RNA sequence: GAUGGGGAAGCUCCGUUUCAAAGGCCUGAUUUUAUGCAGGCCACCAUCGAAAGGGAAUCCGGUUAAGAUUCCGGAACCUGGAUAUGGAUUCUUCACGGUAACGUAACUGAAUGUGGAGACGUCGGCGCGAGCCCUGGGAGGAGUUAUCUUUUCUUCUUAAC
RNA sequence: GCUUGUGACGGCCCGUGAAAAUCCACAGGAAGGAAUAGUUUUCAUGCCAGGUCGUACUGAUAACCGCAGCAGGUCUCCAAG
RNA sequence: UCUAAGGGUCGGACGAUCAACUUAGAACUGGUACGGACAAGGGGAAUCUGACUGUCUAAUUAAAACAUAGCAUUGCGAUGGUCAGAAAGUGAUGUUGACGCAAU
């Protein structure tokens, strides 16, 4: 039965004027404006939430230690482990089959 | 009387196209040495809905021949094409669905989409959900190919004009009744201010030729000379005939 | 048939050393206590040698060809077995179950594998293995 | 802001430099069994954080008050 | 909505990357100098247009006749700029560990490229949080008490970081 | 339970439901780097600065618009038994 | 005023502990009253007419008028149809292309 007010001239229930309610040490109820929630950085070749990488709003990553926004593998943020595991394989297998794609057409060159 | 509705459209205003949500515009690659002489392989990264246009788009990306970077074009997607698909473009590209070949490089029978009207214009003909053009024959008396357009008409364009093998995707969208005004509302909402439509016959004379009253009716042939002046062209425009047919085929 | 051998070269396909070339040196096909699974004692590079042009100076070349090594226990499943093969003799010794635990021993090992590898790369006996594999 | 627990690393803080003042608070708290004992908090105002060290053993506490630099403005109570 | 332009007797109309020679970012040379220059990449590119859209960062207590997320007290955070000490790194020069998902107090990185966040509809049930609502014991204060009720009311709070 | 926030799902479309500033990251390896000594400010700590304009109050059966202290009109948030 | 049924948690077909209200039934009772105030559909048979939901004459007309989905006709392959402008290196449709745009 205690009621509250926005603490900033914006009187409309928009996304940036989200509000929380807090009991203060005064023993009094008060609004407190709440920032909008962050989202998980996503993996840039499958779109999945990057494991190990922190979840701040974008400018916050400039106030954060590097360990918070990478992991220790080829493609720290960027891509997603199963996607670098696929990635290496695909590299190796093709570069191999190149050599072959190559040698095999050099054989059928002599055959002519 | 008053400027009629159909004349007010020319002025843009309330009648321009609703385009905020549109993806980019849909085009072939710009025609380069790659495509003029060989082929160039892109992948289709995503395929995507475009507001106002049933028929989905393919966002397909290619390497840049003259600079180290990637280049994304926006194709119209062609039914069967699928993310992770390689897309080959140009004179030497092989006859698979999804590729883009010069008309002059495909056999008679081949069916294609998004075909250029002049080589290099980046795609003009057969672009809407479901459509395509058929190559009927070729004529190396100047590099020309003769085709069939979705409308019925045959047209002869340059064998250098490119098409993409296959039909435009988006099925038979029109096969489903719209059912309720609201569906048309949302329909035209992503297109343009053309809906609902008041009949001229329910307007007064100031507003339209149909206009006057005492009983609703047109009072003169609704069949207008092509040379009539704007203000007067409402109805059936240079109608070579009028009335119910049951027609069944076109021009062949 | 049964390849997993003494001097097989393979690509680490997971974790930190993901993407890098190595040679198995002690196969342990059976499960270890800690390590209850098919695994292999390997040694590959961690920082490859850099490229070398005619235009390169004296000690530049001497610098552009240092090689940071590494040694790992690694699950067979985190390996891309290759058709290529590299002789394991000079390090054969330094790399055993022993050298794991006690950092210094892992350390003295790397000291040796590095001398060996840098050696191998001069007068290019065995190449390929010295290039990055790019993805 | 911060709480400190290494009674030693505390002691470096008490000299440190930027640390002109500090304070000793005393609470009449009570343990899990519930017997009135003497908790004593050592607050140290550094430039940009307030490191408060909490000592529950009354013995070691009343000792440590005589281990602060004599050139630090300890506010008592 | 200016501009190279094109119409118009003209007030001006059209056009906005447009049929245009449309820039400026690093730093070497030079240490006559902080500076003209030698490198060089990248640029179909005015601007105005949101006090409800997007967006760097603050909270609680106290205070006035009238101001307060603005003053006071205390406790923070962001941005730009300076910088030194510590720590980390290296004779295997640009860190280790973990099979792996990944871990971390850090762990050089120009051009160029590429990816992500900014970033997005509506309805429904289901799960969870917060505040609120109801409520037992107890420590206080108020109320009623001809008669009854271990009773009725009420205080028991915790901010950003 | 109420109000709100939020998640993992599901229904809907011939509707599939902005943009730019801005911030980070990866790929790349130009280049700069130690042994009597250098590298490094995406780790901790420390120094400095943060301008201009608005900021009262009403917000409606009397502070706005309807000649007015007009039974009309005028956008929103909070919500007890 | 009673009866019965519908959960949770923890110890091995029971055993301990915590916690809700809701539902069906039965007896008793009254000046036969009880959704006791508040709240809250009258129903049926037909004819004319418009399919429906939607719309308009702000201040005398809300309707059977307008819309609509559905049906049909007409023009156009871009050197184009329809429309704009005094003129233009001018403009709408058009980020379009006949499963489209335009006109009835």
UniProtKB/Swiss-Prot annotation, chain A:
Note: Present with 23600 molecules/cell in log phase SD medium. There are 2 genes for eL34 in yeast.
PANTHER family: 60S RIBOSOMAL PROTEIN L34 (PTHR10759)
Protein name: Large ribosomal subunit protein eL34A
Quaternary assembly: Component of the large ribosomal subunit (LSU). Mature yeast ribosomes consist of a small (40S) and a large (60S) subunit. The 40S small subunit contains 1 molecule of ribosomal RNA (18S rRNA) and 33 different proteins (encoded by 57 genes). The large 60S subunit contains 3 rRNA molecules (25S, 5.8S and 5S rRNA) and 46 different proteins (encoded by 81 genes).
Signal peptide: none
Gene symbol of the encoding locus: RPL34A
Pfam families: Ribosomal_L34e
Family note: Belongs to the eukaryotic ribosomal protein eL34 family.
UniProt-listed PROSITE patterns: RIBOSOMAL_L34E
Domain of life: Eukaryota
Record's keyword terms, sorted: Cytoplasm, Ribonucleoprotein, Ribosomal protein
InterPro entries in the record: Ribosomal_eL34 (IPR008195), Ribosomal_eL34_C_sf (IPR038562), Ribosomal_eL34_CS (IPR018065)
Molecular-function GO terms, alphabetical: structural constituent of ribosome
Curated annotation (Swiss-Prot), chain B:
Main localization of the protein described in the UniProt heading: cytoplasm
Single GO molecular function: rRNA binding
Subcellular compartments: Cytoplasm
SUPFAM superfamilies recorded: Nucleic acid-binding proteins (SSF50249), Translation proteins SH3-like domain (SSF50104)
Entries under SMART domains matching the protein: Ribosomal_L2, Ribosomal_L2_C
Complex and partners: Component of the large ribosomal subunit (LSU). Mature yeast ribosomes consist of a small (40S) and a large (60S) subunit. The 40S small subunit contains 1 molecule of ribosomal RNA (18S rRNA) and 33 different proteins (encoded by 57 genes). The large 60S subunit contains 3 rRNA molecules (25S, 5.8S and 5S rRNA) and 46 different proteins (encoded by 81 genes).
Role according to the record: Component of the ribosome, a large ribonucleoprotein complex responsible for the synthesis of proteins in the cell. The small ribosomal subunit (SSU) binds messenger RNAs (mRNAs) and translates the encoded message by selecting cognate aminoacyl-transfer RNA (tRNA) molecules. The large subunit (LSU) contains the ribosomal catalytic site termed the peptidyl transferase center (PTC), which catalyzes the formation of peptide bonds, thereby polymerizing the amino acids delivered by tRNAs into a polypeptide chain.
Recorded GO CC terms: cytosol; cytosolic large ribosomal subunit
Taxonomy, superkingdom: Eukaryota
Keywords: Cytoplasm, Isopeptide bond, Phosphoprotein, Ribonucleoprotein, Ribosomal protein, RNA-binding, rRNA-binding, Ubl conjugation
Residues with PTM Phosphoserine: 51, 94, 158-159, 248
Keyword presence, S-adenosyl-L-methionine: no
Cross-link (Glycyl lysine isopeptide (Lys-Gly) (interchain with G-Cter in ubiquitin)): 45, 92, 118, 144
PROSITE patterns for this protein: RIBOSOMAL_L2
UniProtKB/Swiss-Prot annotation, chain C:
Keyword Ribosomal protein: yes
Subcellular location as annotated: Cytoplasm
GO biological process: cytoplasmic translation
Keywords: Cytoplasm, Ribonucleoprotein, Ribosomal protein
InterPro entries (alphabetical): Ribosomal_eL27, Ribosomal_eL27_CS, Ribosomal_eL27_KOW, Ribosomal_eL27_sf, Translation_prot_SH3-like_sf
Gene Ontology terms, MF aspect: structural constituent of ribosome
One Pfam family in the UniProt entry: Ribosomal_L27e
One GO CC annotation: cytosolic large ribosomal subunit
Family listed: Belongs to the eukaryotic ribosomal protein eL27 family.
Additional information: Present with 7380 molecules/cell in log phase SD medium.
Protein name as annotated: Large ribosomal subunit protein eL27A
Gene source species: Saccharomyces cerevisiae (strain ATCC 204508 / S288c)
Lineage of origin: Eukaryota, Fungi, Dikarya, Ascomycota, Saccharomycotina
Gene name linked to the record: RPL27A
Swiss-Prot record, chain D:
GO CC aspect terms: cytoplasm; cytosol; cytosolic large ribosomal subunit
Biological processes, Gene Ontology terms: cytoplasmic translation; protein-RNA complex assembly
Main location: cytoplasm
Family designation: Belongs to the eukaryotic ribosomal protein eL38 family.
Entries under Gene3D superfamilies matching the protein: 3.30.720.90
Subunit structure: Component of the large ribosomal subunit (LSU). Mature yeast ribosomes consist of a small (40S) and a large (60S) subunit. The 40S small subunit contains 1 molecule of ribosomal RNA (18S rRNA) and 33 different proteins (encoded by 57 genes). The large 60S subunit contains 3 rRNA molecules (25S, 5.8S and 5S rRNA) and 46 different proteins (encoded by 81 genes).
GN (gene name): RPL38
Full protein name: Large ribosomal subunit protein eL38
């Amino acid at each position: 039965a205690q009621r509250v007010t926005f603490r900033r001239r914006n009187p409309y229930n928009t996304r940036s004027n989200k509000i929380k309610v807090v009991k203060t040490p005064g023993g009094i109820l008060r609004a407190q404006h709440v920032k909008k929630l962050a989202t998980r950085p996503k993996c840039g070749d499958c779109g999945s939430a990057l494991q190990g990488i922190s979840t701040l709003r974008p400018r916050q990553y400039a106030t954060v230690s590097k360990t918070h926004k990478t992991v220790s593998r080829a493609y720290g943020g960027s891509r997603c482990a199963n996607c670098v595991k696929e990635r290496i394989i695909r590299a190796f297998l093709i570069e191999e089959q190149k050599i072959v794609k190559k040698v095999v057409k050099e054989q059928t060159e002599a055959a002519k | 009387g008053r400027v009629i509705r159909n004349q007010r459209k020319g002025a843009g205003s309330i009648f321009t196209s609703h385009t905020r949500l549109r993806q980019g515009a849909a085009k072939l690659r710009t025609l380069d040495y790659a495509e003029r002489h060989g082929y160039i392989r892109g992948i289709v990264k995503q395929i995507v809905h475009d507001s106002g246009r049933g028929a989905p788009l393919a966002k397909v990306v290619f390497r840049d021949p003259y600079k180290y970077r990637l280049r994304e074009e926006i194709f119209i997607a062609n039914e069967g094409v699928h993310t992770g698909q390689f897309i080959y473009a140009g004179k030497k590209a092989s006859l698979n669905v999804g590729n883009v070949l010069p008309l002059g490089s495909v056999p008679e029978g081949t069916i294609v989409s998004n075909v250029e009207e002049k080589p290099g214009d980046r795609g003009a003909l057969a672009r809407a959900s479901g459509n395509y053009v058929i190559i009927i024959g070729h004529n190396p008396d100047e590099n020309k190919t003769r085709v069939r357009l979705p409308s019925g008409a045959k047209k002869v364009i340059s064998s250098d004009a490119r098409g993409v093998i296959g039909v435009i995707a988006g099925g038979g969208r029109v096969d489903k009744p719209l059912l309720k005004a609201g569906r048309a509302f949302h329909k035209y909402r992503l297109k343009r201010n053309s809906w609902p439509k008041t009949r001229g016959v329910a307007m007064n004379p100031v507003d339209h030729p149909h206009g006057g009253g005492n009983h609703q009716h047109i009072g003169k042939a609704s069949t207008i000379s092509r040379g009539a002046v704007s203000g007067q062209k409402a109805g059936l425009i240079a109608a070579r005939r009028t009335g119910l047919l049951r027609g069944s085929q076109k021009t062949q | 048939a049964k390849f997993l051998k003494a001097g097989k070269v393979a690509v680490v396909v997971r974790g930190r050393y993901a993407g890098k070339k190595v040679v198995i040196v002690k196969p342990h096909d059976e499960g270890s206590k800690s390590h209850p699974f098919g695994h292999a004692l390997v040694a590959g590079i961690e920082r490859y040698p850099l490229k070398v042009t005619k235009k390169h100076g004296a000690k530049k070349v001497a610098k552009r060809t240092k090689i940071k090594p590494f040694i790992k226990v690694v699950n067979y499943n985190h390996l891309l077995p290759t058709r290529y093969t590299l002789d394991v003799e000079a390090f054969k010794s330094v790399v055993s179950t022993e050298t794991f635990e006690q950092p210094s021993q892992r350390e003295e090992a790397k000291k040796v594998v590095k001398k060996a590898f840098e050696e191998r790369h001069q007068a290019g006996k065995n190449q390929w293995f010295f290039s990055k594999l790019r993805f | 802001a911060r709480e400190i627990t290494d009674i030693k690393q505390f002691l470096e803080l008490t000299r440190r430099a930027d640390v002109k003042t500090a304070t000793v608070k005393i609470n009449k708290k009570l343990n899990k069994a519930g017997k009135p004992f003497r908790q004593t908090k050592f607050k140290v105002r550094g430039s940009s954080s307030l490191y408060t060290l909490v000592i529950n053993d009354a013995g070691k506490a009343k000792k440590l008050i005589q281990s602060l630099p004599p050139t630090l403005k300890v506010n008592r109570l």
